[PDB]
Design a protein around this ligand. Structure first.
Ligand SMILES: CCCCCCCCCCCCCCCCCCCC(=O)O[C@H](COC(=O)CCCCCCCCCCCCCC)COP(=O)(O)OCCN
Ligand SMILES: *[C@@H]1O[C@H](CO)[C@@H](O[C@@H]2O[C@H](CO)[C@@H](O[C@H]3O[C@H](CO)[C@@H](O)[C@H](O)[C@@H]3O)[C@H](O)[C@H]2NC(C)=O)[C@H](O)[C@H]1NC(C)=O
Ligand SMILES: *[C@@H]1O[C@H](CO)[C@@H](O[C@@H]2O[C@H](CO)[C@@H](O[C@H]3O[C@H](CO)[C@@H](O)[C@H](O)[C@@H]3O)[C@H](O)[C@H]2NC(C)=O)[C@H](O)[C@H]1NC(C)=O
Ligand SMILES: *[C@@H]1O[C@H](CO)[C@@H](O[C@@H]2O[C@H](CO)[C@@H](O)[C@H](O)[C@H]2NC(C)=O)[C@H](O)[C@H]1NC(C)=O
Lengths: 107, 169
């Protein structure tokens, strides 16, 4: 139940960084459905990449810390831990693509 | 010549550790490590690695320290450890004058006494204690359970470490 509690914490982080990522996607949609605004894009590109990295590092730190708790559970293994870790890494990446896309289009 | 690494982990309790360590290439001090579990700082005293390369080396080392602490926490929750305790990890690679057959090692001591050590021939950890305990059998069980603690650890020692010696003497 240690790992159960720790998966909930992993989830929270992702759920927090998701809603933080969409707080930015909506900012990027309100500024495209509108030179100076073009810099509103660099400031969105920056805040979005800085956010990604944080999210990616905090969540990986979570995975690396629950290496043996998750794999010692019995119906979870190294392969599946590495599978889950990349499945979450690529979940974060995806949001960055959603934001960057808007900017590149409005270019 | 060689690359020796020392890591000293001070556990007051299961939740918190204080790290202290250094690395020496060819008898000269090259790296230092100090700090608690959350903010452990690793610095290179000489600019042996370029900023990108060193950042990748730190990512690796920092992931190891998280994993290491995790294993201590598991051994404790499964077999109960007596705190406070100190874990010494002495590891490295030594290259001969002639030949590529390098000697590699990883000896673990707990509270100044021999605990476990890695045997690279079969990438298996072995006891260094005459005492048969639940903690030793369990730790070895876990150490010999995963590719991470076996072939990846061997790869660090035989490839990562050796290449570093070959590149930076
Ligand atoms: C050439 C190197 C680079 C140059 C820089 C030198 C270092 C500078 C810093 C100075 C201080 C050195 C001290 C640090 C100690 C060694 C850290 C490295 C260990 C490490 O990363 O090994 C990984 C294995 O980790 C694991 O297996 C994780 C689990 C932890 C295992 C714990 C083993 C002991 C067991 C005892 C604890 C239990 C207590 C019970 C009472 C291998 O991975 P890699 O990714 O680097 O591999 C490369 C292939 N791709
Ligand atoms: C990396 O940090 C190490 C911190 O422990 C330290 O290496 C050696 O650590 C032990 C403590 O376990 C000490 O060893 C003994 O050294 C002399 C023998 O020459 C004794 O008279 C002392 O009483 C002491 O117990 C030392 O602190 C140290 N060893 C030596 C020989 O100095 C080093 O600071 C770092 N490693 C290297 C090789 O510099
Ligand atoms: C690692 O070394 C530590 C220092 O030598 C040692 O810590 C000491 O642990 C004992 C037992 O856990 C504590 O003493 C207790 O037991 C005696 C038994 O007669 C009682 O009378 C005492 O009241 C007390 O409860 C010490 O307090 C403790 N030392 C410190 C500094 O807190 C660890 O046990 C060693 N761990 C391993 C795994 O070997
Ligand atoms: C970074 O880690 C340390 C300890 O939590 C803090 O910075 C200093 O780092 C040295 C490392 O040798 C410590 O010994 C000192 O106690 C620390 N303080 C000073 C004034 O030197 C730092 O606060 C941590 N950073 C964060 C963001 O938590």
């Amino acid at each position: 139940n240690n790992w159960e509690q720790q998966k909930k914490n992993i989830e929270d982080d992702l759920d927090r960084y998701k809603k933080r990522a969409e707080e930015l996607r909506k900012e990027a949609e309100k500024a495209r459905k509108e030179k100076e605004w073009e810099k509103r894009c660099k400031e969105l590109e920056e805040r979005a990449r800085k956010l990604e990295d944080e999210a990616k590092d905090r969540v990986n730190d979570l995975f690396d810390s629950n290496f043996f708790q998750v794999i010692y559970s019995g119906d979870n293994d190294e392969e599946e831990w590495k599978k889950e870790k990349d499945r979450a890494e690529k979940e974060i990446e995806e949001w960055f693509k959603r934001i960057k896309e808007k900017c590149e289009e409005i270019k | 010549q060689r690359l020796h690494m020392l890591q000293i982990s001070y556990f007051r309790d299961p939740y918190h550790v204080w790290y202290q360590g250094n690395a020496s290439l060819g008898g000269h001090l090259t790296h230092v490590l100090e700090g608690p579990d959350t903010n452990t700082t690793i610095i290179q005293l000489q600019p042996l690695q370029e900023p990108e390369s060193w950042a990748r080396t730190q990512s690796g080392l920092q992931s190891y320290l998280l994993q290491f602490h995790g294993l201590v926490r598991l051994v404790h929750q499964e077999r109960t450890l007596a705190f406070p305790l100190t874990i010494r990890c002495f590891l490295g690679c030594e290259l001969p004058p002639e030949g590529s057959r390098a000697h590699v090692f990883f000896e673990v001591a707990v509270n100044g006494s021999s605990f476990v050590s890695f045997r690279p021939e079969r990438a298996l950890w072995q006891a260094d204690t005459q005492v048969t305990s639940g903690v030793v059998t369990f730790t070895l069980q876990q150490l010999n359970a995963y590719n991470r603690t076996r072939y990846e650890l061997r790869e660090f020692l035989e490839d990562t470490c050796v290449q570093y010696v070959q590149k930076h003497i």
